[PDB]
Amino acid sequence: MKHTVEVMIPEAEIKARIAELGRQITERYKDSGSDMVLVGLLRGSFMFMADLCREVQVSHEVDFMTASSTRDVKILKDLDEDIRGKDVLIVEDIIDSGNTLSKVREILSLREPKSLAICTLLDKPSRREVNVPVEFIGFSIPDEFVVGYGIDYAQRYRHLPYIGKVILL
Template sequence: MDMRDEILEILVSTEEIQKRTTELGQQIGHDYDGRNPLMICILRGAVVFLSDLIRSVPIHVMVDFMGVSSYGGTNLDSTGVIKITRDVDANVAHRDIIIVEDIVDTGLTMKALVDLMKTRGPGSIEICTFLSKPQRRKVDVDIKYCGFEIPNKFVIGYGLDYDENYRNLPFVGVLKPEVYEKRKEEKG
């Protein structure tokens, strides 16, 4: 079965993503002109966004990766427990840091990441997220660069997954409820 048949609705189209990602890249280039920011991509979901984003940034940037987990398997909500599965290799001291995330939902993960980075003495820290769900926020986070604010729906595509699937969709969509209900039952 084509995975697109499992989509209830498309929230953000491929064309909207391309346009907004280009705008964000240009804005970052303008804001960091003359500097060389370190963009820290939060694995795995933000990889697709970062790949498109950095091609739109007209200045030199460095890239590193960090693995963070707060969801698991078929869970539709953050567990609230933050686990670092891969730390950055770069020294962040005195650097301009841009944390690149796929989605800021409750804000718990992002707050924990920003707090951790602050202990390492960066010159500055900003957040660039592809998606934001302000209705779900449990803690305030200052997002400087936001692709799209979306309603409180569980979304997949463009790097975001459900049970490690759907990341390769070129748009952001909402799964049909019967899809994740069936998967939960199958996993017991």
């Protein structure tokens, strides 16, 4: 489609918000004692994870899964590391339907982590099909056509440092 992109959430607002998520995450987990892992879902989370992990002042590992995108949720690439007895934070660019995150949290729950929580940059609560708890949220937004900061449209705009709105022409 002919289209344009405008800035919706600038780089600077994203960075200020990530520094606040990082203080909240630091506060919840600093006294735990247990090992911690941040788990990104690829490809969407790679940019969010890079900025977020740099703001989390608790010693942790960074790991990644790839899950498939009414069809079953399948593991295309599992974690490299064990999570048994660890504090685990799942990191995603956006929760809309909640279908993937829901099925990913159930799989990881089977491994008996000490705790399991989700951090999303973007939340579209109006799109929710399955309830899943989300402890840390960057921005709540309407159901806008968003790109950037790991979110693609037609293999375009993953590398934008801001969240943009796509205008169909």
